[PDB]
């Protein structure tokens, strides 16, 4: 039985957009921060520094300008940082127009998104599942190892820049990764044990996406008011929480984010709260473990996270064989968020059950399910590019 996003904490119904934006959104943001992801202790830190470390105007055979940028989270050179890779379509640059941007984290390092041998090899720890790693470090054989999830040439040809950062720059994806992470520094606690409401990996990854947007606001080649934040799987959980917390993001894409992402936790289907917290104890707040085998006690569900994106366009997608993510739960979260989108004059999927494969449904709130297993495929991206053409903030209001 789902909590109603349009009923406030005190039981009063939300009938208008101002009550939604100024009362209900803060209530939900605080519930997710306290009970699920942990508190984001601050947004933009003081003294952010942006260093363009490499710049190539004829990358990908002339199709793109490629920039690598160190985004340092404080002015002291000792402060933590992350490494942003940006490809910008040269057709757009050449016209003296700013490009819109797709921004998302990657799993195994910037060098894995494209074979491009000029990308810096990540020097950070990488997980054992990363293809062609050696002792948790990047190798030359890992270049372009994750390119199937990143159709860079097509995204550029459709007029969009591609920006990415390795999630492990922000928090390495290992159960002890928080002690190396941005959280070991921002949270800024003297003691050792993280607090019950302290953020975990998903919060730190989401924060990094907002810091990447801070960089994009300074880059004269891109339109930082037209940034689509996207993610696959655990990085799509991060993309949703980033897009919910930071309304500067113009469009949000959740590709198979599943449990603690788009899927309703109260369905108890596929991955559950207990399973995700037991296997990935660093991903959420310790407070989320209260709901292990007790999803009925959750004061929110993920449809309210989706609702926190409204009125901005939101795309949630699933894979047909990906039972662990609970595709029906991802779809039903979209349906239960739709009333908030409708309050803003937007339309969601028609249909009461999961659509047929490869048949997207919805307006600015959209869903598709594609054949096959968990992944992010060219078919997913084809649909996302069409959505961004239609619903991403325009270059005009002139
Ligand atoms: Mg589930």
Author numbering: 35 to 432
Sentences from the paper on this structure:
Glucuronoyl esterases (GEs) from carbohydrate esterase family 15 (CE15) have been suggested to play key roles in reducing lignocellulose recalcitrance by cleaving covalent ester bonds found between lignin and glucuronoxylan.
Similar to the recently solved structure of MZ0003, both OtCE15A and SuCE15C differ from the fungal structures by the presence of 3 inserted regions (Reg1–3). Reg3 is a 15-residue hydrophilic loop found between, and packing against, the last β-strand of the main sheet and an α-helix (α9 and α8 in OtCE15A and SuCE15C, respectively). The tryptophan residue in StGE2 (Trp310) found hydrogen bonding to the 2-OH of the ligand is conserved in the bacterial structures (Trp358 in OtCE15A, Trp348 in SuCE15C, and Trp334 in MZ003), whereas Glu267 in StGE2 which hydrogen bonds with both 2-OH and the anomeric hydroxyl group (in β configuration) is not conserved (Arg303 in SuCE15C, Val313 in OtCE15A, and Ser289 in MZ0003). OtCE15A & C, and SuCE15A, further exhibited little to no discrimination between methyl esters of glucuronoate versus galacturonoate (MeGalA), contrasting especially OtCE15D and SlCE15B & C, which exhibited 107–9-fold lower kcat/Km values for MeGalA.
